[PDB]
Enzyme design. Structure first.
Site, PDB file in Angstrom:
ATOM      1  CB  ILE A  62      -1.047   0.029   1.147  1.00 22.14           C
ATOM      2  CG1 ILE A  62      -0.364   0.079   2.525  1.00 22.14           C
ATOM      3  CG2 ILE A  62      -2.019  -1.154   1.011  1.00 22.14           C
ATOM      4  CD1 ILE A  62      -1.334   0.276   3.705  1.00 22.14           C
ATOM      5  N   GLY A  63       2.152   1.143   0.080  1.00 22.64           N
ATOM      6  CA  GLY A  63       3.038   2.294  -0.061  1.00 22.64           C
ATOM      7  C   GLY A  63       4.503   2.024   0.211  1.00 22.64           C
ATOM      8  CB  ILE A 103       8.122  -1.714   1.508  1.00 21.09           C
ATOM      9  CG1 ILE A 103       9.331  -1.317   0.658  1.00 21.09           C
ATOM     10  CG2 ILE A 103       6.952  -2.110   0.597  1.00 21.09           C
ATOM     11  CD1 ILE A 103      10.144  -2.516   0.152  1.00 21.09           C
ATOM     12  CG  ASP A 116       5.992  17.389   6.841  1.00 17.15           C
ATOM     13  OD1 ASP A 116       5.561  18.382   6.198  1.00 17.15           O
ATOM     14  OD2 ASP A 116       6.326  16.317   6.286  1.00 17.15           O
TER      15      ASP A 116
END
Ligand SMILES: CS(=O)(=O)CCCOc1cccc2c1cnn2-c1ccnc(N[C@H]2CC[C@H](O)CC2)n1
Lengths: 322, 9
Positions: free
Chosen positions: A25-26, A32, A144
């Site tokens: 998923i990313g 990962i 962030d």
């Protein structure tokens, strides 16, 4: 034998047999991430395989930092640790770290541009602030926060995904060369709340300098006092722009845009979206604001909180996994 | 007020 391997593109996930149905998923520089099903807990999980944690001392230091904070921080509005493991059987073989989290349904990216009622708007913002307040209590200042690193579920619950350090949500302190404190994170909450109301990105700068210009175009050129706090070279640019007066918060967020309440939302916005951090609202005051305070529960909103070689970091990380 | 228990994805 407790483990099996699944090929995930060019990467091998070697995971406990309890974790099935792995799908990527990313990814990013540090890892990962796959969605999976956990057969023992009987729930959906996210499995993060750390990427090159021992390439150098800086990677190892960050990997150690992430492991510890996830273990020690526990709060309903911060992504939690369900499990950590390595497929390797000793320190000598130790290579891979796998971190297991609850699988959330979505980040905020699309959700916030779908029009939400006051209840959902403020409830989501309440949870955000509770998460942030808990991060600040552990000495973590994010810097962030954005829709992409804040996650939700179809039941309207919300967690902050990571611990921080797309420029649209970055505070002026960050944009420019400035010192920051806790309320740097309030700017980002403001940008998100504004986006919820208006249905699009508040300050969509095309580059880092342009990010500044879209901020002042709407809010107004900051005071001389603020300009003084800038480093010489950033000051030479910033101070010599055309002078903008800004728009009042009634002009920026008129009743038309909303689903007492809209007046209360504007008031909060007018206090979060302040360029000069010394004049910006704190997390505690934001949590106490009438627009947010409706949800207050002290168990949620007042919850209680160097140099090594690579092989030394390996050892410290291996202890943490074990 | 009662907390929302649903959210469209
Ligand atoms: C900084 S790094 O370690 O390089 C980052 C690696 C990539 O990080 C990621 C990329 C994608 C998801 C990621 C992460 C890191 N955590 N994570 C998670 C964690 C828990 N739930 C979900 N659900 C998801 C929410 C999004 C939705 O679209 C699908 C369900 N996602």
């Amino acid at each position: 034998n407790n483990f099996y391997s699944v090929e995930i593109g060019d990467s091998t996930f070697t995971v406990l047999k309890r974790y099935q149905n792995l799908k990527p998923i990313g990814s990013g520089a540090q890892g990962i991430v796959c969605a999976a099903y956990d057969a023992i807990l009987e729930r959906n999980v996210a499995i993060k395989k750390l990427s090159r944690p021992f390439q150098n001392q800086t990677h190892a230091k960050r990997a150690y930092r992430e492991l510890v904070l996830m273990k020690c921080v526990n709060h309903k509005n911060i992504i939690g640790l369900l499990n950590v493991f390595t497929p390797q059987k000793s320190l000598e073989e130790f290579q891979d770290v796998y971190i297991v989290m609850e699988l959330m349904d979505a980040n905020l990216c699309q959700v916030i541009q779908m029009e939400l009622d006051h209840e959902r708007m403020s409830y989501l913002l309440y949870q955000m602030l509770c998460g942030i307040k808990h991060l600040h209590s552990a000495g973590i200042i994010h810097r962030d926060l954005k829709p992409s690193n804040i996650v939700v579920k179809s039941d309207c619950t919300l967690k902050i995904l990571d611990f921080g350090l797309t420029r649209y949500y970055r505070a002026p302190e960050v944009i420019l060369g400035m010192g920051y404190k806790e309320n740097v994170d309030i700017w980002s909450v403001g940008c998100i709340m504004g986006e919820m109301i208006k249905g699009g990105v508040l300050f969509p700068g095309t580059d880092h300098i342009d990010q500044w210009n879209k901020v002042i175009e709407q809010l107004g050129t900051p005071c001389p006092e603020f300009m003084k706090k800038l480093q010489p070279t950033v000051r030479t640019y910033v101070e010599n722009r055309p002078k903008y007066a800004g728009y009042s918060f009634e002009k920026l967020f008129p009743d038309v845009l909303f689903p007492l309440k809209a007046s209360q939302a504007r008031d909060l916005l007018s206090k979060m979206l302040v360029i000069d951090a010394s004049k910006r609202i704190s997390v505690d005051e934001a949590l106490q604001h009438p627009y947010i305070n409706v949800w207050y529960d002290p168990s949620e909103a007042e919850a209680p909180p160097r140099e090594h070689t690579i092989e030394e970091w390996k050892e410290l990380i291996y202890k943490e996994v074990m | 007020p009662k907390r929302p228990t649903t959210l469209n994805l």
